Design a protein around this ligand. Structure first.
Ligand SMILES: *[C@@H]1O[C@H](CO)[C@@H](O[C@@H]2O[C@H](CO)[C@@H](O)[C@H](O)[C@H]2NC(C)=O)[C@H](O)[C@H]1NC(C)=O
Lengths: 49, 48
């Protein structure tokens, strides 16, 4: 899709999910923007270590 | 719901009883299927 979807600085309008707790189910769609806990600590609010 | 397809089966039958769910036999026909894809954990009815 080069010709239509590519932009020289970057067409950053395209997102993919990168971090979550488990893998999803067949034909599931998940719309979350909630913060992933990558450490053992719980995470709360906007961001954290 | 099966894999996102939400399905209804039903039966309306006439009766004459003033006690619990009529002891007897019948089958529900399929009525509709809608491809809603949603999660349903829970539900409620609607009175009037
Ligand atoms: C549909 O929603 C339910 C409830 O939100 C999901 O089940 C929850 O899953 C989390 C993570 O495993 C648990 O912490 C909750 O305790 C669960 N609650 C209930 C009532 O199930 C369920 O996984 C969702 N289904 C899909 C396919 O996303």
């Amino acid at each position: 899709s080069n010709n239509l979807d590519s932009k020289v600085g970057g067409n950053y309008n395209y997102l993919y999910r990168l971090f979550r707790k488990s893998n999803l189910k067949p034909f599931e769609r998940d719309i979350s923007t909630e913060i992933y806990q990558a450490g053992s600590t719980p995470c709360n609010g906007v961001k954290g270590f | 719901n099966i894999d996102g397809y939400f399905k209804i089966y039903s039966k309306h039958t006439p009766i004459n009883l003033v006690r619990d769910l009529p002891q007897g036999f019948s089958a529900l026909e399929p009525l509709v299927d809608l491809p809603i894809g949603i999660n349903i954990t829970r539900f409620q009815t609607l009175l009037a």
